């Protein structure tokens, strides 16, 4: 279990014991309980730290991107969409993972794929139920340049085929870093010269997702938008860091704008 | 019926799944197996076999047999560098269309040591000595024979044994490297220098050839299947 | 089959899981591991500091 | 007493007569890489006492308006002895450290410093389109300085203690191995950092394992007629240094 | 969250005596405060933090 | 004092009287301006509930 | 060390880092009244932690010409918390005490105080035909002050340290439980007074069990340019408080 | 697996339940607990009142 | 150290074996054998200078 400490009954004291006094010049932080600073009763305490595990904290699906593509190519979305895999284009999921320096985990990817009708000068629409492909292309694979090209044959590339009006499709991904954990922060460079990309984006090379309609275009236009959700599973995290204080600027840098530590108060004494 | 609930991915077709499906020829009697020589069970049984390396893959030599051989001669000086190329057995021009390199371009990761065998194809009256060098990265390619012998090296002596292996060890920060060229996953440099000279009688040719072979060692593995970039089409073949 | 206690209160209470896949990345997340060791952040000192004694003697 | 300590490494030794214990970061003491965690197959050189031994860095002047100092490692020891020479000739290295900060004062002086070793202390930039350049991340044996207020530039590091040069609360740099030097208590801090990375070994010029930051949280103050020059000296010894991937010198 | 039913009390600091110091040492000093949980402390019910936000995807 | 290092330190001095209150703030470690951007307070703002004792160290 | 101590009573705790032991007056530690020494036949209420807990009194300024201060008990705690409330509603009470005096200074200051708890410290009067009045015996949480030289009045207490306000040698207040606070040694005194009376319980407004007197025997002195305000704070906790004879509030 | 009697008459008759979740809040509601104690509302008196005797003697 | 008891300092006491001359910086002095002396209650600090010699003896 994850059950917390009980309070221990304590009486009056008058001794040379000094639990309250300490030096904080040591890296050590005090271990004092209420049973050291006042009377206290015995409390049998059944509260658990069950949901404050890192495998419950990080284990809820979070949207990491959405990308759009259009049958008509109505508003410059092409007939397929692409996304270079990263976790840093969204504030919320990024912040949770950046409370740790190294994380090894498996992922679970869920896709929520929706479509909508577009304005057109077309008359009479009775468009069949759309099918969509989501193709994962590992680093150094051939890439789509059109919706019709040979790369969508998926002979070794992992791929999902899914039809609208069905449960969101999902696939597990295993741990797959070159290292023995994913690196959230890298204080190095990509060159021995100490030039080029600086930061964690040096070590980012996680392939690219491509997504298209599998159906041929119909006389109107449909735009489909695919939202990608990652959930960490089976997590071990190492080296705790402060939570972010500043809002992010960029998905490849930590650059930040100088921001206040805390919010205002009127004075030292407030009620 | 039995209460059940459908969960995400209930109707998906994942191309890397394995599920059972009804046969469309129930009770079909397959042909008996027989032993056919040369059963493959792994692609590291193909990668551990030598394959001639085109180390002389200049523009004129691509469609000829010049590609697979580098001339070496009796020099009037020490003789400089014979060749050198960045190691990276899946992204280098030199190494990526060999057996090792084309089994590598179906994968995104690789690890382990590989072995470059060299063979002298001169006369039996011709003899030489060569410095075969590997330099781990972070200091660039060696630009002198002095800097090449600070790295890993085998000094090859040409004799009755016609070949010498420079085994190039794994030596990497990460447990794996990317098949693609990536500056974080940089893999070092290979070079060859004259250690002595090719010395030969008057009545035997002053020029000789050298070939290079490459294969995986027994500590070598690959991970993460992907489509190769070396085959393509614009319409269905008919 | 693996039979394991459910999360339940305070002052039946088991569930059954069978894995259906050949990979352990396919498995449901481990949510019932409640091991801790706060002492490597909270007390990362070479000499053991006893609470009742002076920090610095 | 608990205030007196010596640390002997190689042919160097440091003495303290005021210290507030020794912090062993994450409770893990430096050691050589094991055979079950290795991946570099060549024999490692272990120079022992010749590389593991205190190296005193350039001192910094603590002033009343100082906002702090930082040194990145291993790049503050890149020209130091045979530790820096074995960095030149090897692709990989791997070392733990004991970092010892010295800053004595009289009993009529006051001030408080945070001494903290931050793993992977990737830093922001003044301009949000650009990466900070090497000259602004690192000074070598010389420290780079934090500023009290926000700075501007193009490739300059965004320095402003409140953000700690990393976009986080500066008061929260206490989950990292740390000690304080408070002038009315102790005159020295000691942190022992293990090797911490997600790869078992890594190049020593292309990567900085951690950064030592020294940040005044209570300004230096004294009555005029007392000593007005008070240095902070950082003397740091490698521990269990080993290197693989021998080749010619350089790093380009 | 602040809720009037779940009101948690007040913290304060007062002089019990005074800061007494020699002539040649400064009359003003500083005090810092630190905070941490005890070993009886727990939390429940995960939710998004209100301290991080964005108006468009980072690039 | 928000963007400076003044935020983390409260002056205390040799007073010519007893000296009054030095500071005071409502306890509430996840909703108070004082306590909510500390390590304790930012781990609290991913949760809706909390319980247990906490310890304020002063130096 | 013997200089560091904590005393925890109720939800209060005091810390010292300079102290000269604890005096337990007459070698008897506070306790509840026994069944063989009782005479009040109703059940006693014992509020425990709610009344037994340190109560800080109003501080007094130590000056170079100060002649001392006194507080009478239980009438300095008559408005203090639930200790003072249980005095209101009960005919009888009975309590021991731990009295803790605080008075820190620098090492460039000098002075010596006698801290003494005097049982039954009945005091004289300026006029020899009259009794001193309540306003001159007691100030409550505020101290009444001794004077260096003789005073005059009609109902005024005769104050003059030499007589100690009682007509006795002031130097002989050392057979009573006492400690000294000498600024070059300790910054605190602690006396633990048992309940001392010739009746097992007594009314808490009509009678004062003891008086704490604090008398400078070596004047405060320091060189100008040092702190000139030095308080003396008296923080005193009841111990084993119990009460009998519950009725309506008041005392008239 | 838990095997428990069904609700059936008056003058096969079991079902099987397996829990599929790690929480006990996920479980189906308990509908077969028929314990009662009406006496704390119906007879909440300090002295036991015997039916055949006077209420007030 | 024969200062005051309110005076405090730290000093680098160094020995350099020969063949590279005397150290001309504090940087070069700490590449040799050294003891960092911390002035405290203990008023003295020993730099023990080890034998380190090619020969078993040296000339006076
Ligand atoms: C409209 C008239 C016809 O236009 C085209 C245009 C481009 C073509 C490209 C090819 S291919 O690349 O050789 N093979 C493919 C195989 C499978 C897929 C798939 O979608 O799964 C895609 C391509 C084959 C036919 C093609 C017809
Ligand atoms: C129509 C032109 C485009 O307009 C907008 C308007 C507002 C936007 C806000 C954001 S965000 O808040 O940074 N991230 C989100 C992530 C996931 C979801 C989701 O829906 O799951 C929502 C928002 C990103 C793109 C946005 C495009």
From Swiss-Prot, chain B:
<protein>
    <recommendedName>
        <fullName>Capsid protein VP3</fullName>
    </recommendedName>
</protein>
<comment type="function">
    <text>Forms an icosahedral capsid of pseudo T=3 symmetry with capsid proteins VP2 and VP3. The capsid is 300 Angstroms in diameter, composed of 60 copies of each capsid protein and enclosing the viral positive strand RNA genome.</text>
</comment>
<comment type="subunit">
    <text>Interacts with capsid protein VP0 and capsid protein VP1 to form heterotrimeric protomers. Five protomers subsequently associate to form pentamers which serve as building blocks for the capsid. Interacts with capsid protein VP4 in the mature capsid. Interacts with protein 2C; this interaction may be important for virion morphogenesis.</text>
</comment>
UniProtKB/Swiss-Prot annotation, chains C, H:
<comment type="subunit">
    <text>Interacts with capsid protein VP1 and capsid protein VP3.</text>
</comment>
<protein>
    <recommendedName>
        <fullName>Capsid protein VP4</fullName>
    </recommendedName>
</protein>
<comment type="function">
    <text>Lies on the inner surface of the capsid shell. After binding to the host receptor, the capsid undergoes conformational changes. Capsid protein VP4 is released, Capsid protein VP1 N-terminus is externalized, and together, they shape a pore in the host membrane through which the viral genome is translocated into the host cell cytoplasm.</text>
</comment>
Swiss-Prot record, chains D, G:
<comment type="function">
    <text>Forms an icosahedral capsid of pseudo T=3 symmetry with capsid proteins VP2 and VP3. The capsid is 300 Angstroms in diameter, composed of 60 copies of each capsid protein and enclosing the viral positive strand RNA genome.</text>
</comment>
<comment type="subunit">
    <text>Interacts with capsid protein VP1 and capsid protein VP3 in the mature capsid.</text>
</comment>
<protein>
    <recommendedName>
        <fullName>Capsid protein VP2</fullName>
    </recommendedName>
</protein>
């Amino acid at each position: 279990m994850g059950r917390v400490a009980d309070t221990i009954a304590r009486g009056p004291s008058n001794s040379e014991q000094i639990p309250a006094l300490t030096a904080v010049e040591t890296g050590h932080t005090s271990q004092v309980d209420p049973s050291d600073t006042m009377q206290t009763r015995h409390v049998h305490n059944y509260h658990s730290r069950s949901e404050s595990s890192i495998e419950n904290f990080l284990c809820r699906s979070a949207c990491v991107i959405y990308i759009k593509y259009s049958s008509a190519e109505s508003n410059n979305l092409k007939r397929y969409a692409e996304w270079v895999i990263n976790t840093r284009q969204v504030a919320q999921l990024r912040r949770k993972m950046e409370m740790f320096t190294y994380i090894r985990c498996d992922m679970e990817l869920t896709f929520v794929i929706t479509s909508h009708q577009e304005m057109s000068t077309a008359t009479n629409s009775d468009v069949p139920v759309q099918t969509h492909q989501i193709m994962y292309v590992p680093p150094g694979g051939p890439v789509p340049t059109s919706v019709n090209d040979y790369v969508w044959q998926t002979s070794t590339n992992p791929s999902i085929f899914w039809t609208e009006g069905n449960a969101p499709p999902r696939m597990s991904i295993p741990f797959m870093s070159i290292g023995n954990a994913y690196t959230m922060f890298y204080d190095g460079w990509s060159n021995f010269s100490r030039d080029g990309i600086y930061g964690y984006n040096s070590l980012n090379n996680m392939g690219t997702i491509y997504a298209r309609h599998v159906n041929d275009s119909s006389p109107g236009g449909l735009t489909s938008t695919i939202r990608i959700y990652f959930k960490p599973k089976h997590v071990k995290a190492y080296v705790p860091r402060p939570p972010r204080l500043c809002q992010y600027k960029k998905a490849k840098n930590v650059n930040f704008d100088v921001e206040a530590v805390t919010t205002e108060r009127a004075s030292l004494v407030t009620t | 019926g039995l209460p059940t609930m459908l969960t995400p991915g209930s109707t998906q077709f994942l191309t890397s799944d394995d599920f059972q499906s009804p046969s469309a020829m129930p009770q079909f009697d397959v042909t008996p197996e027989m032993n056919i020589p040369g059963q493959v069970r792994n692609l590291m049984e193909i990668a551990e076999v030598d394959s001639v390396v085109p180390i002389n893959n200049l523009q004129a030599n691509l469609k000829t047999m010049e590609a697979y051989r580098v001339q070496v001669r009796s020099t009037d000086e020490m003789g400089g560098q014979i060749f050198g190329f960045p190691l990276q057995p899946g992204a280098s021009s030199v190494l990526q269309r060999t057996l090792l390199g084309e089994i590598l371009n179906y994968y995104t990761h690789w690890s382990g040591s590989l072995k470059l065998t060299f063979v002298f194809c001169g006369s039996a009256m011709a003899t030489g000595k060569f410095l075969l060098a590997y330099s781990p990265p972070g200091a660039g390619a060696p630009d002198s024979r002095k800097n090449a012998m600070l790295g890993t090296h085998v000094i090859w002596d040409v004799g009755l044994q016609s070949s010498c292996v420079l085994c190039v060890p794994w030596i990497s920060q990460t447990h794996y490297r990317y098949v693609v060229d990536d500056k974080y996953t940089a893999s070092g440099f290979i070079s060859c220098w004259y250690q002595t000279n090719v010395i030969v009688p008057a009545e035997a040719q002053k020029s000789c050839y050298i070939m290079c072979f490459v294969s995986a060692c027994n500590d070598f593995s690959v991970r993460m299947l992907r489509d190769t970039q070396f085959i393509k089409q614009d319409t269905f073949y008919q | 089959a693996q039979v394991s206690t459910q999360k339940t209160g305070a002052h039946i209470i088991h569930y059954t899981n069978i894995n259906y896949y050949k990979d352990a990345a396919s498995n449901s997340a481990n949510r019932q591991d409640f091991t801790q060791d706060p002492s490597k952040f909270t007390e990362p000192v070479k000499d053991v500091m006893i609470k009742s004694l002076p920090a610095l003697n | 007493s608990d205030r007196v300590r010596s640390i002997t490494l190689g042919n160097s030794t440091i003495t303290t007569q005021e210290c507030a214990n020794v912090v062993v970061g994450y409770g893990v003491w430096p050691d050589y890489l094991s055979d079950e965690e290795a991946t570099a197959e060549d024999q490692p050189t272990q120079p022992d006492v010749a590389t593991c031994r205190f190296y005193t860095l350039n001192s910094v002047k603590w002033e009343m308006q100082s906002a702090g100092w930082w040194w990145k490692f291993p790049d503050a020891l890149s020209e130091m002895g045979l530790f820096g020479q074995n960095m030149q000739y090897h692709y990989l290295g791997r070392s733990g450290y004991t970092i010892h900060v010295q800053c004595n004062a009289s009993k009529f002086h006051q001030g408080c410093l945070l001494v903290v070793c931050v793993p992977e202390a990737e830093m922001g930039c003044t301009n949000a389109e650009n990466a900070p350049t090497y000259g602004d991340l690192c000074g070598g044996e010389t420290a780079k300085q934090f500023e009290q207020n926000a700075v501007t530039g193009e490739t300059a590091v965004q320095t402003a203690v409140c953000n700690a040069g990393m976009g986080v609360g500066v008061g929260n740099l206490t989950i990292y191995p740390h000690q304080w030097i408070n002038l009315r208590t102790n005159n020295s801090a000691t942190i022992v950092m293990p090797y911490i990375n997600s790869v078992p070994m890594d190049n020593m010029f292309r990567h900085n394992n951690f950064t030592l930051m020294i940040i005044p949280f209570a300004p230096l103050d004294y009555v005029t007629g007392a000593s007005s020059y008070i240095p902070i000296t950082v003397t740091v010894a490698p521990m269990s240094a080993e290197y693989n991937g021998l080749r010619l010198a350089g790093h380009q």
